[PDB]
Design a binder for these strands. Sequence first.
RNA 1: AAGGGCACCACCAGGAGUGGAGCCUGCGGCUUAAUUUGACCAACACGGGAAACCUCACCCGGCCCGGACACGGACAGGAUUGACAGAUUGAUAGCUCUUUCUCGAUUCCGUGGGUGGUGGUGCAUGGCCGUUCUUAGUUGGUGGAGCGAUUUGUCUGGUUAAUUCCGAUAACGAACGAGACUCUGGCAUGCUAACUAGUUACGCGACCCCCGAGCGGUCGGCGUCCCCCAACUUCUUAGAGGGACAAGUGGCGUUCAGCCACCCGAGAUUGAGCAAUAACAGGUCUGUGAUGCCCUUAGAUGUCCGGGGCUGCACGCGCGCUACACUGACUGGCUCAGCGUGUGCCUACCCUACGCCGGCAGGCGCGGGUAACCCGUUGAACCCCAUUCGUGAUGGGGAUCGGGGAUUGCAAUUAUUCCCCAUGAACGAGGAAUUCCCAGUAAGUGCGGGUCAUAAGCUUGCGUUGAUUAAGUCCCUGCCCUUUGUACACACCGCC
Lengths: 114, 104, 55, 98, 55, 67
Amino acid sequence: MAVQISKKRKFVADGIFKAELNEFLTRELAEDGYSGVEVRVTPTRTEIIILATRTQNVLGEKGRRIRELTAVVQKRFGFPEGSVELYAEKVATRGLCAIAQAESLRYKLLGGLA
Amino acid sequence: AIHRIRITLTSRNVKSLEKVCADLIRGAKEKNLKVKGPVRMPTKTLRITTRKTPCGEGSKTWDRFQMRIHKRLIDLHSPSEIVKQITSISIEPGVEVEVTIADA
Amino acid sequence: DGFDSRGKREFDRHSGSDRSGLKHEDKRGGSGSHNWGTVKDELTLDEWKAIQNKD
Amino acid sequence: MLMPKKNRIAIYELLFKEGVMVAKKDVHMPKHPELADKNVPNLHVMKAMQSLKSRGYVKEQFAWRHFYWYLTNEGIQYLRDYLHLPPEIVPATLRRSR
Amino acid sequence: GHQQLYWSHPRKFGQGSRSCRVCSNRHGLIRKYGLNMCRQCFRQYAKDIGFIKLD
Amino acid sequence: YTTPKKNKHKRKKVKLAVLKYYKVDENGKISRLRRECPSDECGAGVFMASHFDRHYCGKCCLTYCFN
RNA sequence: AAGGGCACCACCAGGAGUGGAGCCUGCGGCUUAAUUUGACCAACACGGGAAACCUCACCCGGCCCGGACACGGACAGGAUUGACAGAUUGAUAGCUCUUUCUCGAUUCCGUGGGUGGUGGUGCAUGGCCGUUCUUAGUUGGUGGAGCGAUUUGUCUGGUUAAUUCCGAUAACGAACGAGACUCUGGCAUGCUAACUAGUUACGCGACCCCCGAGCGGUCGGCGUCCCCCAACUUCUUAGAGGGACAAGUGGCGUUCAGCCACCCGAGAUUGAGCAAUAACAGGUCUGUGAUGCCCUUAGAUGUCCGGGGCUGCACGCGCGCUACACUGACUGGCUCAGCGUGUGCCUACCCUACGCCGGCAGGCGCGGGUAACCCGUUGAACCCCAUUCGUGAUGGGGAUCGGGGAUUGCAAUUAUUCCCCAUGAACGAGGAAUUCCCAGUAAGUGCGGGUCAUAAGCUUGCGUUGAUUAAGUCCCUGCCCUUUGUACACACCGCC
Ligand SMILES: [Mg+2]
């Protein structure tokens, strides 16, 4: 209807949100081996899962970093207060994750290993 | 009460869309609600043709990106109420629901 | 004089840099830290305000 | 920077109310989306956050077209003694219900 | 200069009004389906968005 | 380069001393030798200019010319 | 250098053309204040590059700091910020000049230090893309040959679209690429279904009927999920399953791999996507908050604003559009599509029905549609059927140019686009040369998307009508493999 946007634009915009959120999380949590983001969207709330190598690092002291990120992703995307939840999940078999191994390789080469 | 609900399912991947429709019909049939057959709306193909090169030099090759949107309609028409009978929707990521009353 | 009128060079293989050429020559056989490897290498404010304006 | 004190205090109190700060990279945007009641401009908020980052009280991240300033522990006490607060008032990132 | 001429240009349309939602570039804009993304940034992010090459 | 115009001169303020443009008399009687700006946001504090032919509010930019 | 193999970016046999003419557009050149710039099979309607402003990077000018932070000064007896009037300026830029107000530690000055840049270098780089090459090529393990580097495997031959297979065989067993795969098209009167698709049947109508047809004919007329008030999925949609495998027969072949033809069949080769080891100092720093170094950084190469330019014309070239006519042009009538889009975070801008005004371009009200719900049964063009013209640069062509009228935009001049009335240029099938192509193909022919406030002679798709020739070869042009020669190995753009 009039307020609602068409299905085509809605799905394109949802993909846009996925891409931007993934890029921001990549840049922010790159030094913690951020593998990827999986977003479960319900019409009531939005649940997002940061698949990372080090959950103990992506969530800070007492979860400070994860709640800080939750506030950040509220502010950017205009999500209403208390309508989005950020979870952090350890990636299974990280050796099989192409992004994680590339990040560890970047860390090694920055350190100065041959 | 007399109530009739139209639920529309919209997604990108047919496997999960078919699963999330089939379990809805299968669940409601056990609860003895008159379910009209899942209507398959024609799929919407968003097609974007873009130059492969990021510069301009080349043999003028194009990429045909395709985004397919699949839409299903399910109608539950019970003589009694429907909201109290159906309170779970059993969603998986990617699929989006939209509740509608038959008045609309 | 190595270029034509437009500015493209008439001998693309003939390297114009004295430091390096077509082939990649490896510094010290790929030794040192920041280098390719070698065989050896391979092997709350709101409530505070609410009480501030209270009095 | 010719930023008035009302704008400065409003931006600082937002930064301390929530330990995050998001703003589009648009110098010509008339008002910040948040606290637009103060009629501060996005240029002012960008430059205030840039000056905060320069002395190191905040860390800056950039998405496609948005900044993501995160308040630091060094900035906590600077905001405390700039706004004349006891060491009890904290951002929600520091404390939620505890 | 001052307020009355710094951004006084009418920019309600044209190339100058629209910009890349990613890299703030004004060339190759894809406005279909409300993408507002660059010709190159779209090739970068198409997989994330959901556009798949089928044919 | 070599612009035909010579470099523009930026304006420098006069670094004017204390205002004191209202005097007292016989042990202190208030007398505003200047004019007052009547605007409500301007308030009773601020003062009008004293140009040779007009009166100008420094904030509200209201003008009152005598002809 | 020799021998093999392959290919409509090679030919043959053809088709349609291009190069001949006009014009659009892109390069070079000339000119210019600037006419920004990249690129020279694999650049030249390419940078999604159809630039009025913006874009903009160039030129002619004028504002602004959006020069963080540190140190030291100056400073509430003012560091400093703006501004009415006049000049001054294009400017209603307090930009400056006279001028007095106003602003209150945010600034200002100096010294260090930033930062930005469509500035340079693609011959410093990443990523991405193009090409060699979509050719058929590439590599382990074990075993054999070797003192080694290595070689065999990976081959005389047949066969294939394909080192695809079969065979020979010091090799055997594999892997990548090819294939397989995914998508798309072709068939299911078989399954699941559908008031956002409908179809039959039936009921009310509306008309031709009356000779009377009467279960007569037409109806995109109204209805029968107006949910109690029919069924069904054939047509439509979209899911799962099927179906095709050289499977059957004859012939050829080592009688192997396979090849040819025919039957039954919807189909006996539907198109794409993906795509190896590598190489190209190929292209992009003007896609980027990708990026090293250099350059500039307050009279800016930052950024903004005004105007101009990107179009500029003795000339050359490339992709194209329209024509040269009667197989036609004009006028009228009849009659048929499929892709696909459609109201916006920012963002200002949607598709349009219906009625009314005007001749047209358009204008004014009144809706519908965030969409199989409305445009829309997309009444498209070509074509078909009738009229006139009549071999005449002619009723072909509509280039050039005059006048007028509308629309978008802040702004239409160097004419944005559109409409109307006028002049009517070359052009009578195009030299040397040269491009593309094998079946729903070429070609004719229109319609969508992208660009877009206005914009298609471009591009990307779709549909309609719909062929001639060929089922071959290495002649030309190339590429690949083997043998061979090598003083090359940064590898012939070599060495000397
Ligand atoms: Mg005329």
